[PDB]
Design an enzyme around this catalytic site. Structure first.
Site, PDB file in Angstrom:
ATOM      1  N   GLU A 126     -11.053   5.003   1.011  1.00 51.83           N
ATOM      2  CA  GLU A 126      -9.717   4.674   0.549  1.00 51.83           C
ATOM      3  C   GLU A 126      -9.435   5.300  -0.803  1.00 51.83           C
ATOM      4  OE1 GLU A 126      -6.349   2.779   2.478  1.00 51.83           O
ATOM      5  OE2 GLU A 126      -8.453   2.267   2.861  1.00 51.83           O
TER       6      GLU A 126
ATOM      7  N   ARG B   5       0.887  -1.142   0.000  1.00 50.72           N
ATOM      8  CA  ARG B   5       0.000   0.000   0.000  1.00 50.72           C
ATOM      9  C   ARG B   5       0.936   1.205   0.000  1.00 50.72           C
ATOM     10  NH1 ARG B   5      -2.878   3.707  -1.049  1.00 50.72           N
ATOM     11  NH2 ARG B   5      -4.551   4.573   0.258  1.00 50.72           N
TER      12      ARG B   5
ATOM     13  N   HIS C 218      -3.549  10.936   5.252  1.00 47.97           N
ATOM     14  CA  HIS C 218      -4.911  11.461   5.352  1.00 47.97           C
ATOM     15  C   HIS C 218      -5.121  12.292   6.600  1.00 47.97           C
ATOM     16  CE1 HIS C 218      -4.892   7.457   7.193  1.00 47.97           C
ATOM     17  NE2 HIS C 218      -4.802   6.939   5.978  1.00 47.97           N
TER      18      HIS C 218
ATOM     19  N   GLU D  12      -5.738   6.279  11.679  1.00 48.53           N
ATOM     20  CA  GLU D  12      -5.852   4.916  11.160  1.00 48.53           C
ATOM     21  C   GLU D  12      -5.447   3.928  12.238  1.00 48.53           C
ATOM     22  OE1 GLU D  12      -4.318   4.464   7.116  1.00 48.53           O
ATOM     23  OE2 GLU D  12      -3.465   2.497   7.578  1.00 48.53           O
TER      24      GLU D  12
ATOM     25  N   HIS E  60       2.568   7.254   5.849  1.00 51.09           N
ATOM     26  CA  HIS E  60       2.726   5.847   6.176  1.00 51.09           C
ATOM     27  C   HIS E  60       2.701   5.011   4.920  1.00 51.09           C
ATOM     28  CE1 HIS E  60      -1.566   7.044   6.688  1.00 51.09           C
ATOM     29  NE2 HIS E  60      -1.833   5.928   6.040  1.00 51.09           N
TER      30      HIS E  60
ATOM     31  N   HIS F 170       1.265   7.192   1.528  1.00 53.34           N
ATOM     32  CA  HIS F 170       0.141   8.123   1.430  1.00 53.34           C
ATOM     33  C   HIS F 170      -0.154   8.720   2.789  1.00 53.34           C
ATOM     34  CE1 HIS F 170      -2.080   4.547   2.929  1.00 53.34           C
ATOM     35  NE2 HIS F 170      -2.896   5.441   3.451  1.00 53.34           N
TER      36      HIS F 170
HETATM   37 MN    MN Z   1      -3.746   4.848   5.421  1.00 55.80          MN
END
Ligand code: MN
Ligand code: MN
Ligand code: MN
Ligand code: MN
Ligand code: MN
Ligand code: MN
Lengths: 356, 354, 356
Positions: free
Chosen positions: B132, B60, B65, B70, B109, B63
């Site tokens: 997401e 992943r 947010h 999270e 992360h 990115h």
């Molecule tokens: Mn995340």
């Protein structure tokens, strides 16, 4: 009331007063209640008020409400409250005329009226939309949970569980009336709540006293348990007023215990109101609005006010002006230096009608 | 399920459960994912949940947010996360089955699946509208910044910048897979984060356990890095239940790890619900609503629940009734003195089948 | 400006800049003023900005606003402020070019331009709907209260009250202009505010200095009075840029002091903007959005930027890529190992021009 600007009082402004004394009571078995919040008093966004009365042996059943904290002033008689915290701690206490209680958000509690007369009290809630018809009731709860599950939770037979209420009870005079305080022990071993959650407001020494005018104040500073709500009692002699002021950090909800109260309120933008409140009427001053209250009657006046903040903050007009230098004041008010020096030099909180 | 009031279950209420196990996956090159928030589960205001899997050496991508924290539970396999704080500190760590991580709002992360299996995990976010599809992707970022500016920031040529991705990458299996953990060293001199932002949940001693039923709790007391949020594992034997209670300060988001769960929610004003949850299905219990869960089946039950507050707070119907004097209770329930004395005198958190 | 994705800049996004330089000034007696908030610049939710000027002796009258806090940077000239706290405490201080003040929500204040030329300053508010037309004016206040109550509050005759203004004064040049600071004494005993509510920003040593480029920063660490707001000065040389970054905890409001700025903003889901700001124009970056600013001109550039948090937090693309291992970077960007090692390994905050 003439004003230097001839503003049409009230124009372009919500009502700041509510004729609560004329709202009909809703009747229960040994109790009465009425309420005022945004649903009927549009301006009152940060707080809602509930009048409630209980007779001897009548209980407002075990309930909770997570969406609001409950601050209380007992106007007459004698109550007993129970309060249970998220930590399994409990307080079981008497609160009499002039006494407060504070029930933190979502804590379970009850209120019973103890003899010989009728307890009458105010409940102010830190959520404008709060309604005594949307509380969480234990009788409702257990009657709206699968029976098998209640049997399991209590360890009870169907015949036992069958004797529980079938719906919200709300107020009960079914009995028994509670006995002496010392005997009101928890049915199961339970740690006592140690930070006091009731408090004696009426019997405090005045914080401020000026020729009969009196202010008693209970903030977090004197009632730390009511950590985010404050309440005060003001007593006003005929002709006197609470000076012009605003509160930087809180809304003010008001209730007239007796007498007649004149209240004036300044929104910005050349809008303002003034109007009278009868005994049992309600007022509301939004955070930051300028305001003042005057007793214009021939008789004394008593009100309780409540703020949605544990830290009482006031800036009086006089204190404010006193703090500025002549030049600033003269420029702001566009007045002669002779008049400038006659602006307030100290702040006495109340102001007196002219002396004999 | 009969009630005393014969209430019609569900009448006048939103769904308190969502058939997540029936939500289709979205497929990427090395991972899969699905999500549940207010957009398809209207009651879920306080939290949203994401399921995600990562094949070994799938990642992943880096990115962030700012609009959500999270909180994660690793269901299967093994992962490696990196996490970069506003003070330029980094944590690079392994999180295996039963492990948590917490990524503070807006900290950058990445998550990689290490071997040798498929890593499967849940991400829970303290914002019910979280999606997401709405993360800030570094690949998306550079491809959406003026070339000249990217050249300058990196000190690169047009031809070098030309090799960066043209759009949000999201998940990648391009490689390389990651080396042993002691070799995952930052490319530049970087100070390390010292307050742990991962934690081992499944591996804790049961906070409470009765007759095989167990509760494991990770609030800010046991996982201070997750200052904001609390997580718990509940294992429930056939016929047993978590007692009736409510939470004064938090909404509860629930996922069924395995087994079958019965959930009851009581909403006040004579309204209440009861329903079943299959494995991989999700429940949500609004702050302050009374609730209880029960295993009504022949097999065991295992669920993880998450709260949007770091201070776990519970009032059990039993503790509550125990805290009150006979008179108050009798008068409230309108029952006899003799029945009154048989109300709870203690709270065992779970109740066993009779 | 070409991009790898060919995104249509601006598409599906609100404006991130506002042509403030071209907003007409509203004229007062010795003062001018204009403003940008959500009413005309929809994206600017967390902070609104006001441009204001005062001539020598022009005062912005004693007012207050509970709905918002006030952070100011002085662009040209010299002012004096007064600030009264909820505890009858006062600060009276000069603030000159490059200086800040911070007025906490609902504390009462005033601003005078003192000599010799025109004072020019920015006022940034931690509420994007704040409007200078909706403050609480003491003159508006007293002209909108029952006259008899103003009489009683001030201990003044009707004749004396008739002299106070009749409507909101707003900005006055009635005089007298204020004198030397040591003589600007409050009219009645007032304790002084001890925690400084002004601060020298421009005079600070730069926090970061690279090849002519400089950032000066006043967060709560250097200016604890401004407990929940931060401001910075960025000086940027021809060709240079502030590296790509985002702020986890704050929105960013920007004003161009002189020069010509380029702002790029990246907003998630393949949507991004870029544009030019002239001197006097305004930029706004919502919290968490990726951004960078570049000087694409032949002269220098100076901006002030303000944050709605007292704790300054920034993560630079470089700090971030630097903290990951090669495998992670390579896999994320899908690029050769060789290229992976040529990503940033340290963070200089600015980037010097790299064009040959
Ligand atoms: Mn995340
Ligand atoms: Mn209550
Ligand atoms: Mn007041
Ligand atoms: Mn629960
Ligand atoms: Mn102001
Ligand atoms: Mn920035």
């Amino acid at each position: 009331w003439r004003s230097l600007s001839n503003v049409v009082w009230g124009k372009d402004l919500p009502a700041f007063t509510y004729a609560f004394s004329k709202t009909p009571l809703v009747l229960y078995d040994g109790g009465t209640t009425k309420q005022v919040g945004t649903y009927n008093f549009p301006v009152s966004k940060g707080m809602a008020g509930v009048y409630m009365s209980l007779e001897p042996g009548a209980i407002r059943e075990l309930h909770w409400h997570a969406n609001a904290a409950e601050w209380a002033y007992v106007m007459e008689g004698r109550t007993r409250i129970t309060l249970t915290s998220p930590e399994g701690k409990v307080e079981i206490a008497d609160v009499d005329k002039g006494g407060l209680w504070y029930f933190p958000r979502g804590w379970g509690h009850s209120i019973e009226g103890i003899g010989p007369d009728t307890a009458k009290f105010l409940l102010v809630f830190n959520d404008g939309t709060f309604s005594e018809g949307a509380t969480f009731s234990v009788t409702d709860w257990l009657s709206h949970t699968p029976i098998a599950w209640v049997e399991e939770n209590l360890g009870w037979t169907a015949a036992q569980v069958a004797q529980l209420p079938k719906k919200q009870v709300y107020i009960s005079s079914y009995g028994p009336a509670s006995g002496p305080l010392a005997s009101a022990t928890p049915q199961g071993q339970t740690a006592k709540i140690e930070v006091p959650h009731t408090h004696n407001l009426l019997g405090q020494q005045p914080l401020v006293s000026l020729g009969g005018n009196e202010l008693r104040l209970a903030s977090a500073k004197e009632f730390p348990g009511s950590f985010n709500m404050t309440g005060a009692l003001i007593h006003l002699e005929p002709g006197a007023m609470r000076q012009l002021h605003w509160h930087p950090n809180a809304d003010e909800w008001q209730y007239v215990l007796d007498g007649e109260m004149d209240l004036t309120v300044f929104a910005s933008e050349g809008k303002a109101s003034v109007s009278r409140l009868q005994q049992g009427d309600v007022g509301y001053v939004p955070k930051g609005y300028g305001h003042a209250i005057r007793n214009s009657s021939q008789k004394p006046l008593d009100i309780v006010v409540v703020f949605n903040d544990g830290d009482y903050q006031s800036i009086d007009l006089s204190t404010w002006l006193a703090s500025n230098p002549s030049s600033v004041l003269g420029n702001t008010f566009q007045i002669s230096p002779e008049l400038t020096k006659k602006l307030p030099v100290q702040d006495t909180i109340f102001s007196l009608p002219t002396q004999p």
